[PDB]
Symmetry: D2
Subunit: 494 residues, 4 copies
């Protein structure tokens, strides 16, 4: 039961989306969109720049004004709309999963069974919170009545990467809209198409115009205009550390807008001697190779206790030699290409660093094919902590395996990184599971599993892996602004 589109994908939505209207770029400029598997242009899309961002902000601001339909409508009706949007995405699931695969280099079975399901589930999750966002009444000192309103912040700019275009769009807009904000979204330039399809469903669902505005285009242009905008109240971002820095600096220099960032990881696994070995090998393998390694949570440092290290490495190699590379639309294909040249170049450079720095190559180590940005799935053993491949996020299908004998020592090595997005602990010992997970400086710690992510759980980094949490009860906080209202009364009673 993996259904496909029974007819070919026609691209339809290629324009800037503002006030539920399709707009050309102010400049009239357009930019190409490619398929990473063939390197062939799929279509051209309107190139948004500062002007267009200003128009989206004006629209978003107007939709947020006191008295507008989006401010005055029932919170439950905000939730009603998100739920309807989820039904619509469910309706065009074949279409959207195909678009995502073709534009994103993303295996179609994953796109359909995982990304699409996740979008749908996350929207329904966010829909449910709308009329459950609540302030407090507070027994303040003195004769006063004090309450708080957890209001929407206002206009939220949301800058989205290319690895999970749809999932990231929903993670950004679900919470924001549930809380009553308005949004200006900038998709990755590589991957605007699915966002614009969803924009058509936003209109069809009946969101008031200006509540969601989507401005495709480039980072230093559209992206920067957002980060430096004097009338955007908050910017949320997932992507590189470099750009994260640029965003915070821009925000600080302009209007001190709120910022929340999700950036790299170099997430470690710790595998103890008593671990279920096959379970640990399987989760860690998928933990690093998922979506061609193009995952913020990629399990890119795997520490295995010496007595099981050789066995662990052997079975990891076996598992990795089993992939089929090719077009992510063809059933049976189990590894697509990397998103683009730059990522491809970075991965190969880093692989080359691994060889030169004296890591042990178990398989892969080079590119594949005549077309597309394919990289062989690659495994390194005997990796040490000073190697580039141990320190830097690779974002490619490249796994690092490394041995330890001292538990104290491996916790410190696991934490000796400016990243801290997630980690994995594999053991049958209760005390070790609890104590190790407490001691890892990482936003999500999985025990005897890896890459388990759901709408009900907050997600975010420690340290330079970012700030703030997305999703879960806790994530909803980052899309509200608390206002305290305190009223003089003649006499208070408990």
């Amino acid at each position: 039961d993996l259904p496909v589109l029974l007819t070919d994908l026609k691209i339809q939505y290629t324009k800037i989306f503002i006030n539920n209207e399709w707009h050309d770029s102010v400049s009239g400029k357009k930019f190409p969109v490619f398929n990473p598997a063939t390197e062939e242009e799929l279509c051209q899309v309107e190139e948004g720049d500062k002007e267009d961002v200003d128009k989206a902000v004006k629209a978003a601001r107007q939709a947020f004004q006191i008295g507008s339909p989006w401010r005055t409508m029932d919170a439950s009706e905000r939730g009603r709309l998100l739920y309807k949007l989820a039904d619509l995405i469910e309706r065009d699931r074949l279409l959207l999963a195909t678009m995502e695969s073709m534009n994103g280099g993303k295996l179609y079975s994953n796109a359909y069974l995982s990304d699409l399901a996740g979008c749908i589930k996350t929207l329904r999750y966010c829909a449910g919170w709308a009329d459950k966002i609540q302030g407090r009444t507070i027994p303040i000192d003195g004769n006063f009545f004090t309450y708080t309103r957890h209001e929407p912040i206002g206009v939220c700019g949301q800058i989205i990467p290319w690895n999970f275009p749809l999932v990231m769009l929903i993670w950004k807009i679900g919470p924001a809209l549930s809380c009553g904000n308005t949004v200006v979204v900038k998709p990755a330039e590589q991957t605007p198409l699915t966002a614009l399809h969803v924009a058509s469903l936003i209109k069809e669902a009946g969101f008031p115009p200006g509540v969601v505005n989507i401005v495709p285009g480039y980072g230093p242009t559209a992206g920067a205009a957002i980060s430096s905008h004097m009338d955007i109240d908050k910017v949320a971002f997932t992507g590189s550390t470099e750009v994260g820095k640029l965003i915070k600096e821009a925000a600080g220099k302009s209007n001190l807008k709120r910022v929340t960032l999700e950036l790299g990881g170099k997430s470690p696994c710790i595998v103890l001697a008593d671990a279920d070995l096959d379970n640990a090998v399987e989760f860690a393998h998928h933990g690093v190779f998922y979506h061609q390694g193009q995952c913020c949570i990629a399990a890119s440092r795997i520490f295995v206790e010496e007595s099981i290290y050789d066995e662990f490495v052997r079975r990891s190699v076996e598992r990795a030699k089993k992939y089929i590379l090719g077009n992510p639309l063809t059933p049976g294909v189990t590894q697509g290409p990397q998103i683009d040249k730059e990522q491809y170049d970075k991965i190969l450079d880093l692989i080359e660093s691994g060889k030169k720095e004296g890591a042990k190559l178990e398989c892969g180590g080079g590119p594949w094919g005549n077309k597309g940005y394919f990289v062989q799935p690659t495994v390194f053993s005997n990796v040490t902590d000073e190697m580039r491949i141990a320190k830097e996020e690779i974002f490619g299908p490249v796994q690092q395996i490394m041995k330890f004998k001292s538990l104290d020592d491996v916790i410190k090595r696991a934490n000796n990184t400016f990243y801290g997005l997630s980690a994995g602990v594999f053991t049958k010992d209760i005390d070790k599971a609890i104590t190790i997970s407490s001691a890892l400086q990482a936003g999500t710690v999985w025990v005897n599993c890896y890459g388990v992510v759901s709408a009900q759980c907050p997600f975010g980094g420690f340290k330079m892996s970012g700030n703030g949490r997305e999703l879960g009860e806790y994530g909803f906080h980052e899309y509200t602004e608390v206002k305290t209202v305190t009223v003089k009364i003649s006499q208070k009673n408990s």
Copy 2:
């Protein structure tokens, strides 16, 4: 560092406490209080009855009126007072721990190091919640402003047992007072003395008069008047199942007052083959014998996997043969007497049932001494589920050990009881710890420990072990009444 009173205990507070005044009984009647270790009368105390309860209710109601000092004072000042009460109990810790030991038959080192510390810590815990009890603001449908006040309920009657006189007093009054209620407390007739000492500290701390009223006396008289009172808003009770039934019936027949009950247990432990055996033997042993078995959470059914059953039983017997019986005030003494004749008679009867029903006696089985209600610490092995000693709460120093070989089967046996107060799981397997604890129908489940109780955790039964939770964030709910206030406005905004 176990300090003692350097001079003999003089009893001073022997009267009914209402409106911060010491009152004689309306009847003029008094009743004896005894020391369970010597069977000798310590003093006489004013016998409260219906009349006196009516006076306490009138006082409590007046103190709760809108505009009174207790309703209008800052919530933080309610907390200030509880904290001061805790300082005072800390000041008279030697006095109070000695009184508790002498009146309660309670080992003095436990009284000092545990009961007193617990009272003090729980008061400070409850103090901290006072100005953190909060309502909500709610995004209701339509043009309205809606908030909730989590108000105190009103006059709470609180009926207290004899096993932990002081601890139970603090568990009842800490939460109730933090939430702004007023209370009418009825101590166990066996153990009024420590409650009345604390009453003097309530006055010294400066609680408004009528906020705490203490009416010593008997159950069918004072107790029943509370349960059937038409102006008491809530009754809380810890004690027997029988009386729990009487209370609920009385409440239903009178004014449908809120009721929360903590009643027996027949709490099971499940010890798996892989358990740390000594750890499990030690916690389970203390789990059943603590305070002469006079604990609601007594670990009175211990299921041990067959392959470690004989070993478990052997070491449990060793551990139990090591006690020293005698006066709980004398250092070195490690087991005091039972509270009174009735409890003593019940324990011996049940021991006799165990012998007649064909359980295996490993040690004890009879009374001890010429004076005091002492029972030898007693262990039974080969106990089956149909035996009285397997089914009924003993509330004496009597341990039941029982074997299993099928994990499915033992979970069902562990749950095949109308009680459900707590349980213990002993294992090194993570999955078993989590899955077993989920499947036990019990309010508290300890893993690789037992009898761990703290102010930060809610505590209460499943099934006929009672209803409601005490302590923790969650317990505070049972001492508030939610009022929804909904105000028409011209236009709402998110």
Copy 3:
């Protein structure tokens, strides 16, 4: 836009619903169902009794067992099912609103626009909470890891009245199912039909069998079997004070099951001189007359400041003389009949008490028509606090108006009642709105409105109007059982 059924209502579902199966009664007995507007039998329905209740409990218990589909399914999938049930009720909205009108004596426009909309909205609300019900992790003293699971309680029996058959069914099952409980519902004998239609939609939606069981029949028979059942964990009830007492007594005598009750009110309004007079007259009028006065929150004592009292009474009379009595299915009809003989007899008796006790009759005072249990809308002025019509819940179209001159005095009169379900305050003074609403002993206080009830707000009584809250964040608490899990660890860290 008030659409109707374009074809006549065929009754189809007339049987006991257990394990998603339609069952005959064990006895083979059936009972008539009538239309209160014509006094004519609509159909016959299987009469459930103790036996049938036992079968529903066995089914509900089996569906709740550890490992069953309802325990193991994702919480979000529980929510998915409630949302689907809401879509289905939306699909059969014409059918269900017509059935409700014909069986319940309920105005069809209200049934369609209000009851049906409320059911649908409340289900969607409850759906949203399913995967947002959360426990805690707790910084307990000592080296332990402590968490809580907010588990479903288990088998919940739910006894439902006839005034809002559908709304009450949804209020009971929405929260219960969202929290993962299983239910045994007993509809009012007068009004089983809509519950059984919904049961067919429960099957169609795909709830696991045994999760919802509906047992139509009579109170002393089916109802009592529930209240006294040894394997039902909680009973929830809306109805009379008398039966509420019977339920609590039954629960206390049997297995100490949890009980939550919603019972009468004699809800007061206080209208100050500065009130918007027309607004206050309009809300108070609808507050008392809604659904032929057959509302728990009926505004059955209206206190008006002397200087505006005569004016208030005059305009209230005008408003009340405007009704059209008749069949609730016919457009234009603005007052249907009372549910049945007993209610009719009670209303007329109480009207007669009002005349004999010297209250002033402004209009009505007698029955209407040749068929159906119609009572003229009736207004009394100069009512005093000792009159039966001031003290007792009438549950008929009978309004009491009463004057005050002293604000202190009227708050005490408003509170001088064993009821406390709701109240209304009408004023333009901020301080008075806040202080008066704080001082009224009532679960919901409306300011400058009345009868505003939504899914986002908890709802329940003070005093003998019941215990517990339904709906809102807070109401969900009453459908969970908290279990504390505390695990020994070697060393804890903050």
Copy 4:
């Protein structure tokens, strides 16, 4: 009852506080501290710079390591320590209030009755939250057990201004320490003395060494080292907008540390025709003049409805002509000096702008005295929105009064500012109170009062008045880092 020090203040604590040790500066450099009332040096204090900050960070980091006393101690014991610190500050209240007055230019009666009381109350408030900071257990999709730990972040740098030296120290360290963080505090260079006294009490209370480190010194040196530190996890700051920008930029460039800022305001009051005029005049007057206008929440734009504008201005002038300037230690003195030259120069410049720009001078307008940075209390009427005195935070005793006739218009004018810290609404109309307060873009809105600030309420800005909230339940969030722990299990049950 305003007691004083019965002997002269001896300055004792003048050094850098690290690991509970008093340190000289690495450079050996010291800097003068002055009394703003006399312009005379009080003493010299060790000048902390980058080196010293590095030492404090190393100490704070070590104290935060897994396994340290501050990580492993009971949460309730963290709370115990804060409560003890509060007792100690209460003990040295005369000393501390005098030091604060003499160093801060702060009226002694305010220092004693307000600042000191606030510190003490806020510490006790923060103490109470320690063991009530809780994570969640979460019904995630799939067979997993998921919980969250709300952990301390780590090393928090805290940069403090001179207007409320003590209050700001407690607002920063109370929450941070309650949540289990360690701190590096940099006092205002003008006002280090009271922070260092408190440091001695931190030692006396028994906080583990390295938990609180205080590094007096200058902003571009000590301050910047904090903001740019690669091992500080979070920086909190109260002060200028300029420095706020510098901090965020520094944080973004270095290690992307979390940042929370409280910056200026230009907080508006809106006074409607129906307002209680005297109440509004009194609160607004104190709202702007408190502590010589050196308050972030200064009510520096007062919009009054035309029909009451002249009256409002007249009575405001009367109230302002009543002050006595002089040394803040002398009883009867009702206005002290400004903190220093720079602030003095800024205030006078802005006053001069007001005159040149054509605002109407009602009183004041110039400096006062031969010594000290005194400015006459100054009132301007007929102020327009384009004037410097309407746009810029003055931070001096300078009040702006301004008329409106259109309610829509005044809400927009009130919001037409990049600030948004607080606002005041004065009216007897319920609907206006609620709707206006909702529509103002400000973190705290007072109704019929002003400057009401308590520990139980969160406090923070909208827009460029900052980000994050301090105090209240909500403020505690900004001092925790959420970690999600997700464990694979064989089968989950609800």
